[PDB]
Design a protein around this ligand. Sequence first.
Ligand SMILES: N[C@@H](CC(=O)O)C(=O)O
Ligand SMILES: N[C@@H](CC(=O)O)C(=O)O
Lengths: 295, 323, 309, 300
Amino acid sequence: LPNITILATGGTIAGIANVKGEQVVNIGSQDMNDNVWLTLAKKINTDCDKTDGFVITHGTDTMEETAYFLDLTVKCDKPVVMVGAMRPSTSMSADGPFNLYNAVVTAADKASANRGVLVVMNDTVLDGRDVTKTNTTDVATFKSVNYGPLGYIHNGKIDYQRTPARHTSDTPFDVSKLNELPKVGIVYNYANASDLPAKALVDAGYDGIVSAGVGNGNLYKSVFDTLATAAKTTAVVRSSRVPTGATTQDAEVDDAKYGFVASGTLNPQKARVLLQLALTQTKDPQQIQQIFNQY
Amino acid sequence: LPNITILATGGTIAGGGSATKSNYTVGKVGVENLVNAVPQLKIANVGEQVVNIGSQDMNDNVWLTLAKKINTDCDKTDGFVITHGTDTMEETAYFLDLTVKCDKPVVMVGAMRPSTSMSADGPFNLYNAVVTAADKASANRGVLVVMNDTVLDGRDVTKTNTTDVATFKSVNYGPLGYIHNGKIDYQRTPARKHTSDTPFDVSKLNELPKVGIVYNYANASDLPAKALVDAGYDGIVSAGVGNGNLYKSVFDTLATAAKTGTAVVRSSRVPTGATTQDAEVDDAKYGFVASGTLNPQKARVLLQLALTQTKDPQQIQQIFNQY
Amino acid sequence: LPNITILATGGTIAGGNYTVGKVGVENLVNAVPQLKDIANVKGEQVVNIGSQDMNDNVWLTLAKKINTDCDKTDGFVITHGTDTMEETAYFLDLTVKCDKPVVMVGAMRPSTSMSADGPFNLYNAVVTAADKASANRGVLVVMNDTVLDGRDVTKTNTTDVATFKSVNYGPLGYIHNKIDYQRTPARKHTSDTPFDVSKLNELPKVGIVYNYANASDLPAKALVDAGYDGIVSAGVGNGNLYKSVFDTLATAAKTGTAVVRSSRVPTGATTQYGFVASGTLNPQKARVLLQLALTQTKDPQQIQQIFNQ
Amino acid sequence: LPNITILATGVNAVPQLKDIANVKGEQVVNIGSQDMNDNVWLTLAKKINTDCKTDGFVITHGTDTMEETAYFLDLTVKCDKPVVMVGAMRPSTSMSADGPFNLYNAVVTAADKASANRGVLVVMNDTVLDGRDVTKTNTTDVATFKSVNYGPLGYIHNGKIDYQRTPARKHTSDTPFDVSKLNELPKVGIVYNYANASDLPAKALVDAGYDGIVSAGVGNGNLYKSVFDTLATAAKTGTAVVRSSRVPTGATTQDAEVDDAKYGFVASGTLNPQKARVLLQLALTQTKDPQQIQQIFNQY
Ligand SMILES: N[C@@H](CC(=O)O)C(=O)O
Ligand SMILES: N[C@@H](CC(=O)O)C(=O)O
């Protein structure tokens, strides 16, 4: 049988294949940070040749952030499948066993390769870029809200009907010998939104700022002004607190005039992930925007 | 016919750009020109231009102006229709839902496409909004949002999509009724207290307590919360991850802010589902408030009003458990 | 503690590829020791079958049981198959004269499976059946942490444990650890209906015909040939019908048969022909209501008023 | 500009199309889409196949059965040029009639080459949808058409399409289905399952000797006992029987509660009843064997 290594990183999930298990760290994913991300990726890139595929048990809270980061830093072309649980393992009707079950299936399937980093939840294979946590409590919380799942799992078989075109081998981000990430913060937009948050990050000389805008990534006037001065003086990506849909160019915001970057379908967390890595290679908004159109 | 007062605030309903191209500005078209875009209203007898702005610049002053209109002119009309930007309609609609002391159907409506666009959605939406406002069965339902042929309540309505004309959805509890042929089959009503049942009286308020929102994500910086605390904000909402949790940095500063009096509400960046008590965070232990089903923008609204009557974390927790 | 009586009909929840309705009611209770902390659970095995074989006789039995024993218990939970629960639940919603909570629950995964969903479903069903806030909402279905109304709950997905959704108007409340009730159904239900099945041992014959391109009209004609009392059309779009099928139902309606227009399109109302528009009711739910109406009238005009209920 | 042929089945009104393409109109038929049928399909496919010349096609169609025509054309059109279907949920007389911008975007999609080699497409309310998974979800909503199982191929903004997906099942040029030489399609009907379901509708189709029957089963393609009894005898008389589901989302899978291979049934996978009918009709043009039909249903 193929050999699949389970990498455990935390999450309620604790709190066909020849399966080996290693625990890298054990944290709530709400405390997820650059160091675990750099450690997790360096682990998988180092042990790529040593196994047939990886399954990663993780907290569901920032699962979408980790999955996107690995989707952009994993150079291992072998399947990397992320998995978690919404109910505790000791609790009744614990969902984790069959989730992890399905993840090993996904990681064992030879058809799964070259689909990037995947997330497997509730009988479904989700792509790392579009997966998001939809609901605070549901076991079916994970969804690709914009483009949808890649496949469904039944009786150990996967009917793959999609593959993402936007990852893994094909990305230029190499964090192998990197021990820090650029600083990227996220500011929320709302009625009468305060600029205090964005002013705080700019004054700290943050490399980047993501805007959790309203609608098509729009900003409150105070915020927009301040981010306009920062971008023109800090990288600023426009994303949206809106859970679904692209933050587009050519709507109500001339980004060129302002040197903003429209985040596309990337939500504020995922936009942050991509902005962080883009700032390891360039700081020009005109250049970054090209990165955001391909990843 | 019923008398419906249309209060205009701006919005992509009142915005223009060419019909093809997608660049456009909002809070352009004056109300009077929107009335004319919908010849088929003489349903009701159409009005006032309060502001003409993109709803992304919506703020307490416009909120307070809106509430003061509706309550003072309640007896002079049969119901109101508020033309608004889609971006914060869920916020405005919730504030009015907590502050309007009238019964008249207060129905908010917007458009995802500019009025100059091809197949602009605003004319027929505004039609159904008037329809909604004119049907008195809409009375006693709180502040409503009528979008894409659907009637939604101000508490649960939220913007699901950045571009879809079907963008608005009551994701957690669902719509109140659907509109066909100028007729509404209402099958629900919201259970939380709204409008006339709220303990909030804005008649003598010209400004709201200061409440900001901090976002949560991996490795999150705590400088925004430290900035809001240092700024003496009355309330802070965290758009937490999952069931309202915080990154260690952010939880640290808010732990200290809450202990020295700041209202701290735990909500979720997660668009649907409740941020509940007794999960991973013991709210009674750090004097916090779980926001329940209220998303962060809506949680801000409730904490702002709550801070007009009380600064007790036990007391706020029930305001959030009741509205 | 409250007395909750569990009425079992089968389902995957009681099943063990897999077979439905193998396990008995005491074993669905056994499997969750925690129910001892919440209610005094008693059980009755009404039938033990896959809900794809659910039928009128079982419907009539359930309604009479719930109606007769309403004064013997504090609330009922019905363990049931997920395939037709949306029908049974809506049937009970209109025929139960009991005001006490009547809660339906099921499983998408067998009792034998990894991550079997029935235990926590059945627990949450008993909680709901025990909560005083649940009474007077009509018949409820509790699946995957949520209280759903019998009228609007429908099965949205073929395999998901979260399949059940009130797709048009949404859930009534959410269950965590004790229910956040924020909605209540406005159409009339339970003790508020004009339908009395107590002394009925058969129901009027109602069938369903599907519409699609090139649709054959032989299925509609077969139901016409059988003198079926009612025909629901699973139409396309907003209750539209293929030409040949529309012709046959025109003849069926003209010779006395009730014809309700519904839609195969899973969401939204089929709107208001001397036909009956089903409104938001999908074909199977439209079927149950049309069945009941034909116990009180066969007037299409009065039948449409029933559907506006 | 590319030459786009708009084939109408049910203009000067949108002048902004002419900013994107050189329109040819042509009235293939004049029908309500609830009356869509095999003959319009055979004509549509043969028309497109012969005129494949042009740079792309746009097909204006009623929304009610568009998902059937889209899938049928998805499997029988041999042209690799973009074939885009579009309709309106609101009449053109309405206040906010959606047809103009839909038609606009359909021409945009059809004129874009990135659209080629994605099969037959459906463009409705700002979205590029694949012919296989696209389905009509809501009775009146303008946002009704959506790919519920696997999702949209791209979104249209400002007359530009961000394609991020393509369907993996074989379509168009990779299919063995050639309707060019057919003047009729095999007779395949659909029966619904519900509690107490009557077997009279399915027996009517067996009595008329239909080649194929699709079951809109409950749950994972299950059948009421009466209907199963009937479909079993039909399979026993060489009839093809495909198990689908009235449930709008998810696959009707093998290895659940019905031993397909024992009875000779085919699980439809994610194909819903009307779509399963389209493929079974074409499947019956090449074979009448359940292993081969089931394979075909895992292939398309
Ligand atoms: N920025 C606009 C967007 C819209 O109206 O759709 C607003 O909310 O005012
Ligand atoms: N009675 C249903 C139970 C389920 O599927 O959950 C069935 O037989 O399929």
